[PDB]
Symmetry: D3
Subunit: 256 residues, 6 copies
């Protein structure tokens, strides 16, 4: 298995002892994803991508973080929806920091954090900085971290053309839209109910944000764009592009 | 499915709207469990118990906490072992506190916290107290929490007898011993290999603790007692006992 | 007299809030390197200048700006390894925002516009707001409203972008110390900008991931992510009018008399 | 003169530490209800009295005790809903333990015994130690050693249990305000114990789970978890000698000259 | 007894049930006090004063805080001295905050905080503000706190004359000097050896502070002024003056 | 050239630190009411002005000032119940100071002068410094030195005092929005002062203790603790010159070439 959790401590110790061990940490969230998809999408997707990449490059995958930072209206619909269960920033920051401290204790020095929930980004960044700060105080400066959001590897114009034959309207409205729904149809079809999709026009917002979050400014379903045209085939394409691109990036930063 | 993560937010909203919704949260850890068992045992076991209890009483199960508090020598072998990845107390406390705050926001009011890692206990308690303090400030006083360790439900002398026909040495040395291994043999056979079990005598300690933790005071394999006598049969018995007991406890504290 | 709260007596401020619909504006910046051609307080100067003009136009007041912001990030501000840049931890910034909101609510104020001028501050500003509003709710206050925005987001009109980038726009991701901020500085604080010192390097490009510890070799030596060679006072005057008008209208909309 | 650090001049204390193998002891207690028959500072008085005698016997010193501990839990101390009980949040207790260790390390001390007298303090004491040692490590100090113990854990000999509970021992989980602490108090602080006020109720029993908010009905009205009717100063004298001897030996073993 | 710690919870409950109960909290420190006195002086003195005041007005005294904030050169000699054991500001602030929260829970509403260590001042103030802020959230606005340093009640020129016939040189030098030593000689003579007093000239400093603290800027003995002219007689005067002055202040702020 | 770090490019700042003898100054103020006759940013303006003049004379640089300080206290600033006053919690201010020192150390700076203009900030500034130095020590840095001072403490000479308060001096404990500060302002920011609004009330007095919640009735209505009627530009100019000279010498003394 490539999952650290499924290994004995002796097996893990041996992999790290090899001195070239790469660890991967999926960071997700329990967040509403429309009327047509389950709420653990942000955990399922980065974990599935990590699994495949780890199998290609000989890396291991740590248990993913099940809860992420508060959903923001313009990216995830807003933290007023039921189901969505969010952590405070200090909590998420602290979790990332603690794990890095422990991995360094094990002797590990290479970590890939794969985020699947946009709002997690900066707290993940602070967790890394605080951890690296401590490691320096402890005389350690060779711990390297690569942070990435799997979707960012889908930029090829040709690929976008395939995924959005009618035209691409941007990633800003991709919450429970074509992209994630397609990936889910290719990985966890049983967790998708495409007939429940509400085909509303893409969400549009003014150049600012309002707090407390106003429910009226988010499409009723919770989605920011329609997944009506999502499909397994699209998911297949996305998965291949992401897996191959990420595998290459990791080989580049953590050369064998 | 009884798993909240697998439901759409609409489905979740409806279960909570019913007004009698009981939620269950498994709290585990990534911790060494000897030469013969995987490291995510503390998550897998309470999650499996929750699943079965939930199916019988009509409850829902939240994504489990994958990382818990620092392993202690007399209970989990010590936090010096490789693989074990632990959180600071404030981090675990904050995670529990944040989740409760959010569940209260959904309108949920009944929570069962099932601990699978002994060391988690007091930080789970502080997380609950801080959350309930906040809820009072918010005018909420009807949120009720039941906290339990699934193992505490195995007290029937007749059962202990069938489990330890050679005599019961206590629960203080069960880390990776007969109890957990038997459960794993019944639930996750592929994550256990009794052939690797190190049949050493039960671990014993003086009436005090020493820090920095001394590795010499913990059996080399990481286990506190031998799981040589573990069996699927024992696991099946343990499981049915815990499931039935916890289900009744919940029916008692959260009467329909 | 002045739109700045700091230049008012407590009696004057008190009277303005007594009006019942007084809008307060809070600039949130940073002390950060901005290439060889500009001073390091740009992120404070620009939003403060936009707030001043907007406040004057719609009758609002401006609170003292936050001089220090969150750690500079490589793909947005060059990186926190540069000297001069002086950054706060996330908890520190979040707490500052939270404290100020708590205090404004104590004054009786209920309308706040936070104008961020340093990209990296965004999420910590968001957390400060949420923690403050959470607290206000425990105190029985649910009518405090906050509008958060980055002034640059109001420059959307294609016709405006074409005038600013006649050779073609390449995205906002590489603007640190580039044409946009430099043009604004040329129009507002020409004394703090030396365009002759601009290093005309190609636009910074990055792979779809980030690396820590930050690698100095991945940021153009000058610290800028794009060349401000084509920056000008006229482009700055255009940006200012667009931002001021767009933001002033947004406030009238969200905070009507 | 005295074994208490607080009663020494800094010169005296300094001289003792200069010895190179000076052991320090820190009692960690609480202000908690202990039934109708005993005062509320029991958790401080007892470990402090045991520390005093142990310190005297082995040549160690005793630091001022922590007067406030973690929130009382129903199954161990009755619950934090009782009047009088004054508890600290976990972070507060953890931070106090951490600060003291940091300071002792600055004095040059490297041997500490933490004697807990309030069960609920346990894990927060543990975290204080870990955070302090983590910090000492960053400072290049890895020779600071800590021994943590609850004095009651040294009464293990069945022959002793038999004398204390001739009618049969029923576990330590119900001891709060029972035979054990009451006997020690009768031997150490007779003026602070009124055995005639004891409420002889049956041993408290609970299901295999905990409930929050704490339900007052699940704790005996007096606050005690078991009756101290059979307590006596003679039982207390026995307990004290067993603890003093056992702990003194443990310290000589872990902190030899 | 007037000490809360020596009462049973039933007795305490009864005194608070009266509705006019006044509580007193001594706040000291473990700090070096020259070659002639013990290090718990800042705990002993305020506690002694509280006892006598409490006896006269019918108040109760809470267990005192034994550890205070870091010693500052111009007030306590500096935190570079051995023996001195100080807490970080957040720790002291939180301790004060937690106690007030609990006293409020008991139903108490009148608190007198007697500081015996100058450096505690601002952290005590923050602890009080944070606690009162919290009480408001809970709906409590009738909790009142009086903060005072017993020394401030010795201002009468006549008394000053009697204490300093050779003229008073100010308070900013009264650390382990005449004032405190005189109180100790009268209250805890066994913890004072006047023959050890180092008769050095009053300490003086430039109009600024330096960090790291500079040892050479503090009189070698740790004292800021000689206590050679200290006496039991002076102590008795100080004591009675303070006890009386404070009792009157409390009667006024917490009118019977 | 400028003495303000904010107005310099990172290259100019880097060059000044590279010299190896660079001294930095950080003004720490507050947004606090100052009577009916002055603006609320006095505590930032004054220390900043003094820093500029001192910096110009000794060749030092001035960091952007902290605009928000600790909660106002009745006996010193009048109380935090006044509108306009916008205060931070202690941890927030402490962390701000701590973060800045950590960053300055990272730049290679090693000499810092913290000029406080708000009495209540004092102890939180001290804690920020201690936590930062503790941290630097873990990093292997022990050559970072900080000088903390309040410009008002350099005006003690009887010659000047007599000139400032010929009618008689009553101490500094009553100098909030009074003669000392108003005179400095009249000499530095006359437009932000209107002596015609000064409320000539008797010097404030309080019992030997504090009360919380703060009692408004114990603070003179205007918010001032002593009349500034006798304040003058002439007096301000005297103070300024005295402070600037004294501070410059103190710095020369602590941070010798
Ligand atoms: Cl997302
Ligand atoms: Cl376990
Ligand atoms: Cl920017
Ligand atoms: Cl106990
Ligand atoms: Cl003192
Ligand atoms: Cl002031
Ligand atoms: Mn998401
Ligand atoms: Mn475990
Ligand atoms: Mn920026
Ligand atoms: Mn207890
Ligand atoms: Mn003191
Ligand atoms: Mn002030
Ligand atoms: Zn998503
Ligand atoms: Zn286990
Ligand atoms: Zn910028
Ligand atoms: Zn007890
Ligand atoms: Zn003292
Ligand atoms: Zn002032």
């Amino acid at each position: 298995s490539v999952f650290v959790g499924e290994l004995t401590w002796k097996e893990y110790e041996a992999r790290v002892a090899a001195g070239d061990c790469v660890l991967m940490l999926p960071v997700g969230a329990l967040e509403q994803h429309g009327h047509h998809m389950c709420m653990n999408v942000d955990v399922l997707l980065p974990t599935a991508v990590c699994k495949r990449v780890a199998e290609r490059i000989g890396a291991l995958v740590m248990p993913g973080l099940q809860y992420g930072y508060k959903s923001q209206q313009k990216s995830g619909g807003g933290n007023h929806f039921p189901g969505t269960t969010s952590l405070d920033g200090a909590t998420l920051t602290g979790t990332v920091q603690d794990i890095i401290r422990e991995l360094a204790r094990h002797g590990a020095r290479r970590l890939v954090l794969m985020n699947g929930h946009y709002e997690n980004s900066m707290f993940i960044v602070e967790g890394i900085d605080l951890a690296l700060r401590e490691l320096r105080y402890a005389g350690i400066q060779d711990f390297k971290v690569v942070v990435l959001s799997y979707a960012d590897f889908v930029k090829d114009p040709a690929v976008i053309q395939q995924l959005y034959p009618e035209g691409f309207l941007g990633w800003d409205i991709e919450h429970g839209g074509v992209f994630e729904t397609s990936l889910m149809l290719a990985l966890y079809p049983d967790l998708v109910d495409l007939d429940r999709v509400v085909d509303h026009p893409p969400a549009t917002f003014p150049p600012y944000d309002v707090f407390p979050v106003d429910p009226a400014r988010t499409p009723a379903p919770g989605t920011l764009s329609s997944a009506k045209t999502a499909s397994r085939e699209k998911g297949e394409l996305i998965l291949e592009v992401c897996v191959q691109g990420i595998a290459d990036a990791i080989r580049e930063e953590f050369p064998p």
